[PDB]
Amino acid sequence: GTSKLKYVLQDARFFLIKSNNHENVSLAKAKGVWSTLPVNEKKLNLAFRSARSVILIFSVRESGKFQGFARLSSESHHGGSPIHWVLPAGMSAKMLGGVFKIDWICRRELPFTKSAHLTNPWNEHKPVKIGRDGQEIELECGTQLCLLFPPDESIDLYQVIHKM
Ligand SMILES: CNc1nc(Cl)nc2c1ncn2Cc1cccc(OC)c1
């Protein structure tokens, strides 16, 4: 069903994450972690303290798709188990470094063709696929976008609800 998913998304905040490569999204799916640039790290930390759920919606550049979505379970933390991100040209490991723990809600893909009817008020009402890494998605658009994804029957939202 979709009832527990709707409960997790209630009064949530949503952020578009743009990854330059599939390898980083795969590593985030396997390890339950994400790292971003300091400007976005600051926005996510503020959002985490502000809302019952902060949802990251992932898209790999040039893929034409979203690759799933996850809920922050922590603020960013440094030190600890390092992460072998694939870094773009211009990208050093120091610029990442802050690591958020995340709980996946859906690891399934959604093609942009299916979200063409959803516009983001916080990005000039452009289609929600359009946006820089870290762009916030308004509540109603973000909720409807997450509800478009195919159900991921491998995930049990009971433990996610308990984190709240
Ligand atoms: C593990 N985290 C990430 N991995 C990857 Cl491959 N791309 C990311 C990540 N976070 C944000 N982006 C987008 C990006 C890429 C290169 C230069 C940027 O300067 C604005 C922005």
mmCIF file of C-alpha atoms and ligand atoms in Angstrom:
data_model
loop_
_atom_site.group_PDB
_atom_site.id
_atom_site.type_symbol
_atom_site.label_atom_id
_atom_site.label_comp_id
_atom_site.label_asym_id
_atom_site.label_seq_id
_atom_site.Cartn_x
_atom_site.Cartn_y
_atom_site.Cartn_z
ATOM 1 C CA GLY A 1 0.000 0.000 0.000
ATOM 2 C CA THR A 2 0.818 3.711 0.060
ATOM 3 C CA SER A 3 -0.503 4.676 3.506
ATOM 4 C CA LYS A 4 2.750 4.421 5.474
ATOM 5 C CA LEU A 5 4.546 6.258 2.633
ATOM 6 C CA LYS A 6 2.048 9.126 2.883
ATOM 7 C CA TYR A 7 2.624 9.223 6.646
ATOM 8 C CA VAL A 8 6.381 9.520 6.161
ATOM 9 C CA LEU A 9 5.878 12.325 3.611
ATOM 10 C CA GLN A 10 3.515 14.314 5.845
ATOM 11 C CA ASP A 11 4.888 17.839 6.325
ATOM 12 C CA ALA A 12 8.206 16.693 4.848
ATOM 13 C CA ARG A 13 10.756 18.826 3.068
ATOM 14 C CA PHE A 14 12.171 17.704 -0.262
ATOM 15 C CA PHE A 15 15.476 18.383 -2.030
ATOM 16 C CA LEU A 16 16.633 17.459 -5.534
ATOM 17 C CA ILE A 17 20.035 15.743 -5.526
ATOM 18 C CA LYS A 18 21.909 15.732 -8.841
ATOM 19 C CA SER A 19 24.776 13.258 -9.095
ATOM 20 C CA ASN A 20 27.332 13.429 -11.882
ATOM 21 C CA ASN A 21 27.618 9.625 -12.048
ATOM 22 C CA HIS A 22 25.765 6.411 -11.301
ATOM 23 C CA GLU A 23 28.569 5.028 -9.130
ATOM 24 C CA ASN A 24 27.921 7.519 -6.330
ATOM 25 C CA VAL A 25 24.195 6.777 -6.265
ATOM 26 C CA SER A 26 24.977 3.056 -6.192
ATOM 27 C CA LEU A 27 27.343 3.547 -3.257
ATOM 28 C CA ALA A 28 24.689 5.606 -1.444
ATOM 29 C CA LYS A 29 22.127 2.827 -2.033
ATOM 30 C CA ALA A 30 24.521 0.192 -0.648
ATOM 31 C CA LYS A 31 25.874 2.108 2.365
ATOM 32 C CA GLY A 32 22.995 4.386 3.344
ATOM 33 C CA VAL A 33 25.052 7.593 3.125
ATOM 34 C CA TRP A 34 25.216 10.788 1.118
ATOM 35 C CA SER A 35 27.724 13.625 0.855
ATOM 36 C CA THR A 36 27.270 16.994 -0.858
ATOM 37 C CA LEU A 37 29.022 20.333 -1.345
ATOM 38 C CA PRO A 38 29.304 22.596 1.729
ATOM 39 C CA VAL A 39 26.605 25.042 0.551
ATOM 40 C CA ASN A 40 24.084 22.194 0.260
ATOM 41 C CA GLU A 41 25.388 20.526 3.425
ATOM 42 C CA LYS A 42 24.451 23.652 5.383
ATOM 43 C CA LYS A 43 20.948 23.737 3.865
ATOM 44 C CA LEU A 44 20.362 20.056 4.645
ATOM 45 C CA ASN A 45 21.525 20.397 8.248
ATOM 46 C CA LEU A 46 19.157 23.336 8.799
ATOM 47 C CA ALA A 47 16.330 21.399 7.164
ATOM 48 C CA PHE A 48 16.973 18.273 9.259
ATOM 49 C CA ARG A 49 16.345 20.155 12.509
ATOM 50 C CA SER A 50 13.294 21.925 11.018
ATOM 51 C CA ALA A 51 11.050 19.128 9.715
ATOM 52 C CA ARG A 52 9.785 15.694 10.716
ATOM 53 C CA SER A 53 11.242 14.254 7.482
ATOM 54 C CA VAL A 54 13.793 15.568 4.967
ATOM 55 C CA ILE A 55 13.587 13.661 1.673
ATOM 56 C CA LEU A 56 16.366 13.538 -0.943
ATOM 57 C CA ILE A 57 15.222 12.706 -4.491
ATOM 58 C CA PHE A 58 18.143 11.521 -6.615
ATOM 59 C CA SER A 59 18.828 12.014 -10.307
ATOM 60 C CA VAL A 60 21.974 11.059 -12.218
ATOM 61 C CA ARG A 61 22.867 13.736 -14.769
ATOM 62 C CA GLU A 62 22.071 12.722 -18.367
ATOM 63 C CA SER A 63 20.127 9.622 -17.266
ATOM 64 C CA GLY A 64 16.687 11.081 -17.984
ATOM 65 C CA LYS A 65 15.449 9.528 -14.759
ATOM 66 C CA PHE A 66 15.237 9.766 -11.013
ATOM 67 C CA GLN A 67 16.928 6.818 -9.259
ATOM 68 C CA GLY A 68 14.916 6.805 -6.031
ATOM 69 C CA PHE A 69 14.476 8.745 -2.802
ATOM 70 C CA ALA A 70 15.626 8.542 0.802
ATOM 71 C CA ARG A 71 15.043 10.199 4.184
ATOM 72 C CA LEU A 72 17.831 11.877 6.132
ATOM 73 C CA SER A 73 18.346 10.050 9.411
ATOM 74 C CA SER A 74 21.125 12.336 10.728
ATOM 75 C CA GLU A 75 22.906 15.622 10.252
ATOM 76 C CA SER A 76 26.270 15.526 8.496
ATOM 77 C CA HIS A 77 29.238 14.073 10.390
ATOM 78 C CA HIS A 78 32.979 14.032 9.711
ATOM 79 C CA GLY A 79 35.609 11.416 10.387
ATOM 80 C CA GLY A 80 34.643 7.791 10.570
ATOM 81 C CA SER A 81 34.489 5.224 7.792
ATOM 82 C CA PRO A 82 35.663 6.957 4.588
ATOM 83 C CA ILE A 83 33.682 6.772 1.361
ATOM 84 C CA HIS A 84 35.185 6.208 -2.088
ATOM 85 C CA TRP A 85 33.060 8.666 -4.027
ATOM 86 C CA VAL A 86 33.894 9.076 -7.712
ATOM 87 C CA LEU A 87 34.793 12.699 -7.954
ATOM 88 C CA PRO A 88 34.122 14.826 -11.052
ATOM 89 C CA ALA A 89 36.743 16.980 -12.715
ATOM 90 C CA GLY A 90 37.249 19.857 -10.280
ATOM 91 C CA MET A 91 36.172 17.796 -7.288
ATOM 92 C CA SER A 92 38.296 16.978 -4.243
ATOM 93 C CA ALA A 93 37.394 14.662 -1.383
ATOM 94 C CA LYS A 94 37.678 17.571 1.068
ATOM 95 C CA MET A 95 34.731 19.337 -0.599
ATOM 96 C CA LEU A 96 32.553 16.353 0.307
ATOM 97 C CA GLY A 97 33.661 14.898 3.642
ATOM 98 C CA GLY A 98 30.469 15.685 5.522
ATOM 99 C CA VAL A 99 28.463 12.445 5.546
ATOM 100 C CA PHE A 100 24.712 12.171 6.102
ATOM 101 C CA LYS A 101 23.093 8.887 7.050
ATOM 102 C CA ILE A 102 20.000 8.152 4.938
ATOM 103 C CA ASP A 103 17.250 5.513 4.920
ATOM 104 C CA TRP A 104 16.060 4.583 1.463
ATOM 105 C CA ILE A 105 12.350 4.802 0.840
ATOM 106 C CA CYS A 106 12.435 3.749 -2.823
ATOM 107 C CA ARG A 107 15.384 2.384 -4.823
ATOM 108 C CA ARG A 108 13.374 2.158 -8.074
ATOM 109 C CA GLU A 109 13.712 4.476 -11.063
ATOM 110 C CA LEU A 110 11.210 6.991 -12.401
ATOM 111 C CA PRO A 111 11.631 8.401 -15.942
ATOM 112 C CA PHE A 112 11.283 12.174 -16.334
ATOM 113 C CA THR A 113 8.531 11.501 -18.898
ATOM 114 C CA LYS A 114 6.266 10.490 -15.991
ATOM 115 C CA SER A 115 6.821 13.693 -13.965
ATOM 116 C CA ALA A 116 6.178 16.135 -16.830
ATOM 117 C CA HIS A 117 2.922 17.323 -15.221
ATOM 118 C CA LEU A 118 4.672 18.423 -11.987
ATOM 119 C CA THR A 119 6.133 21.935 -11.669
ATOM 120 C CA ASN A 120 8.178 23.264 -8.741
ATOM 121 C CA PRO A 121 7.070 26.684 -7.387
ATOM 122 C CA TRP A 122 10.503 27.179 -5.796
ATOM 123 C CA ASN A 123 12.155 26.933 -9.245
ATOM 124 C CA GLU A 124 9.924 29.274 -11.247
ATOM 125 C CA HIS A 125 7.348 26.511 -11.932
ATOM 126 C CA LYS A 126 9.749 24.704 -14.199
ATOM 127 C CA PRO A 127 9.215 20.937 -14.459
ATOM 128 C CA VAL A 128 10.454 19.303 -11.286
ATOM 129 C CA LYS A 129 13.206 17.408 -13.176
ATOM 130 C CA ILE A 130 14.843 20.827 -13.730
ATOM 131 C CA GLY A 131 17.013 22.116 -10.921
ATOM 132 C CA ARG A 132 20.542 22.378 -9.594
ATOM 133 C CA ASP A 133 21.875 19.973 -6.976
ATOM 134 C CA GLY A 134 20.221 20.926 -3.698
ATOM 135 C CA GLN A 135 17.179 22.703 -5.166
ATOM 136 C CA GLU A 136 14.304 22.566 -2.712
ATOM 137 C CA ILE A 137 11.009 21.134 -3.997
ATOM 138 C CA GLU A 138 7.790 22.583 -2.568
ATOM 139 C CA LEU A 139 5.739 20.224 -0.362
ATOM 140 C CA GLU A 140 2.850 19.473 -2.749
ATOM 141 C CA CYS A 141 5.077 18.923 -5.793
ATOM 142 C CA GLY A 142 7.531 16.828 -3.770
ATOM 143 C CA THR A 143 4.777 14.656 -2.324
ATOM 144 C CA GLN A 144 3.223 13.991 -5.720
ATOM 145 C CA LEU A 145 6.644 13.249 -7.235
ATOM 146 C CA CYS A 146 7.438 10.626 -4.575
ATOM 147 C CA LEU A 147 4.004 9.052 -5.055
ATOM 148 C CA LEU A 148 4.744 8.574 -8.780
ATOM 149 C CA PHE A 149 7.590 6.148 -8.128
ATOM 150 C CA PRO A 150 6.870 2.439 -8.472
ATOM 151 C CA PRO A 151 6.376 0.849 -5.051
ATOM 152 C CA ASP A 152 9.575 -0.674 -3.644
ATOM 153 C CA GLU A 153 8.359 -3.881 -2.008
ATOM 154 C CA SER A 154 11.821 -4.586 -0.584
ATOM 155 C CA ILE A 155 11.548 -1.737 1.960
ATOM 156 C CA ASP A 156 9.499 -1.793 5.171
ATOM 157 C CA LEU A 157 8.638 1.742 6.286
ATOM 158 C CA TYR A 158 7.870 0.597 9.849
ATOM 159 C CA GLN A 159 11.448 1.267 10.995
ATOM 160 C CA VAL A 160 11.555 4.601 9.152
ATOM 161 C CA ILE A 161 8.397 5.728 10.960
ATOM 162 C CA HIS A 162 10.066 4.860 14.282
ATOM 163 C CA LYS A 163 13.024 7.147 13.500
ATOM 164 C CA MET A 164 10.519 10.018 13.403
HETATM 165 C C1 LIG B 1 28.671 12.096 -3.461
HETATM 166 N N1 LIG B 1 28.091 13.335 -3.933
HETATM 167 C C2 LIG B 1 28.088 13.720 -5.327
HETATM 168 N N2 LIG B 1 28.646 12.904 -6.350
HETATM 169 C C3 LIG B 1 28.623 13.338 -7.726
HETATM 170 CL CL1 LIG B 1 29.324 12.319 -9.010
HETATM 171 N N3 LIG B 1 28.027 14.624 -8.083
HETATM 172 C C4 LIG B 1 27.437 15.486 -6.999
HETATM 173 C C5 LIG B 1 27.463 15.071 -5.706
HETATM 174 N N4 LIG B 1 26.879 16.006 -4.948
HETATM 175 C C6 LIG B 1 26.502 17.003 -5.776
HETATM 176 N N5 LIG B 1 26.843 16.688 -7.039
HETATM 177 C C7 LIG B 1 26.601 17.502 -8.214
HETATM 178 C C8 LIG B 1 27.877 18.223 -8.632
HETATM 179 C C9 LIG B 1 28.971 17.451 -9.358
HETATM 180 C C10 LIG B 1 30.242 18.180 -9.785
HETATM 181 C C11 LIG B 1 30.436 19.660 -9.486
HETATM 182 C C12 LIG B 1 29.336 20.428 -8.758
HETATM 183 O O1 LIG B 1 29.516 21.792 -8.492
HETATM 184 C C13 LIG B 1 28.337 22.546 -8.464
HETATM 185 C C14 LIG B 1 28.054 19.711 -8.334
#
